[PDB]
Amino acid sequence: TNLCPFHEVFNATTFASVYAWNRKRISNCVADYSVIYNFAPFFAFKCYGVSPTKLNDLCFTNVYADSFVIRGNEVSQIAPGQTGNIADYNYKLPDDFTGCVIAWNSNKLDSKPSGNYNYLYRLLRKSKLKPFERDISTEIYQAGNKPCNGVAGPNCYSPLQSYGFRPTYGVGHQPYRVVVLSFELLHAPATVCGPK
């Protein structure tokens, strides 16, 4: 009775970057769906082919959470509609994703005096991309002739560039935190039900 780890995803005091892609396979939860519906005013609560009103009466076997920080201009593309840099290189959803995508403004707590580090984004890795598969490989990308053999530098500056977030009440495309939720149903009993 009343045992759920949902509040371990929200309010983490440190959100993983898009390269980290902090998953959390959550099971055995029979309460605490109020932390999802009632919270700070959500910038986006775009759910998908699982009815958000009907979850309190439907039990799930696996509840997968995913958290990351992205720019407010890139609050889209968290959907089966693969489009954009973050979609084609960083993070992507399947065709029949059955879950909810929650996003909210994080400009109030991720404000930095200097910024331009601690968060990264990908430029070009089109040769490798799979849904629910993080590509944390960051050695080098192919350009010119030689991959600079890991001692890269001038004339082989092809590797990725990190985010330049430094909001000091001086940005409009503020950084937003996102908590993606997904569900699965297999040939196994469902353990994540609603409160009784």
Epitope: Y37, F45, G49, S51, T53
Partner: antibody
Framework: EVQLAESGGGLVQPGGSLRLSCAAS????????MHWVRQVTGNGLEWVST???????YYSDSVKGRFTVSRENAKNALFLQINGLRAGDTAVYYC?????????????WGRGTLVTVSS | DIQMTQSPSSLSASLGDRVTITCRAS??????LNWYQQKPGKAPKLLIY???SLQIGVPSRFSGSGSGTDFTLTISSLQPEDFATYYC??????????FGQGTRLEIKR
């Protein structure tokens, strides 16, 4: 018969508040979800908002921020509260009931309360 | 954000004509598409839910079916009570449930 009513129709000043209601008949109002879908005069349908059985509220992109749906299981009446209307909101807010299933579908539409926003 | 671009509304036909109302979306919505029939003298009403399931009180000629991204609210034979506007709706995205622009069924002469 099983029909959805409506109220709150009438002329209103731009920016003034307004409340619409949606009475129930026959069916159980407390075990079915309710939705609001407005239709601009001569245009097509446009989804506005909805509140589920568990009291959870949902709104649209051009609706969230100033509208506030309200459900009271007593009197079997759905409610919708509006704040700060404008000219682009002149539409008939058809009340709708959500049927049982895994996806949202509207199986009972009300008569439709008309809202004309102008000074 | 998910678009629901429908076929051109200018689709005239007489009685009995096999009208085929086609409506597509921006991506796969599964079987969550559903139609709505609105005569411009009364309230809206649904025709097909789940894109394949006939509504109670709707005859068998309303054979609206489809799969994945393509749907056709086909009426093999019309009736004087069928001339109205028809709207498609997707339920894949639950909170932003979007509609189409519509299609008007008019009597041909």
């Amino acid at each position: 018969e099983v029909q959805l009513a409506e109220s709150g129709g009438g002329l209103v000043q731009p920016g003034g508040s307004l409340r619409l209601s949606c009475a129930a008949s026959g069916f159980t109002f407390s075990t079915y979800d309710m939705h609001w879908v407005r239709q601009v005069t001569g245009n097509g349908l446009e989804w506005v908002s909805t509140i589920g059985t568990g009291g959870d509220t949902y709104y649209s992109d051009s609706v969230k921020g100033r509208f506030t749906v309200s459900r009271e299981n007593a009197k079997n009446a759905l409610f919708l509260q509006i704040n700060g209307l404008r000219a682009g909101d002149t539409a008939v807010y058809y009340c709708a009931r959500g049927g049982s299933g895994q996806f949202w579908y509207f199986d009972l539409w009300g008569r439709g309360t008309l809202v004309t926003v102008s000074s | 954000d998910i678009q629901m671009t429908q076929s051109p509304s200018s689709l005239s036909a007489s009685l009995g004509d096999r009208v085929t109302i086609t409506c597509r979306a921006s991506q796969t919505i599964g079987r969550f598409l559903n139609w709505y029939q609105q005569k411009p003298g009364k309230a809206p009403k649904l025709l097909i839910y789940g894109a394949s399931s006939l509504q109670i009180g709707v005859p068998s000629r309303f054979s609206g079916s489809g799969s994945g991204t393509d749907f056709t609210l086909t009426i093999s034979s019309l009736q004087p009570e069928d001339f109205a506007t028809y709207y498609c709706q997707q339920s894949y995205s639950m909170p932003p449930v979007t509609f189409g622009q519509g299609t008007r069924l008019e009597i041909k002469r």
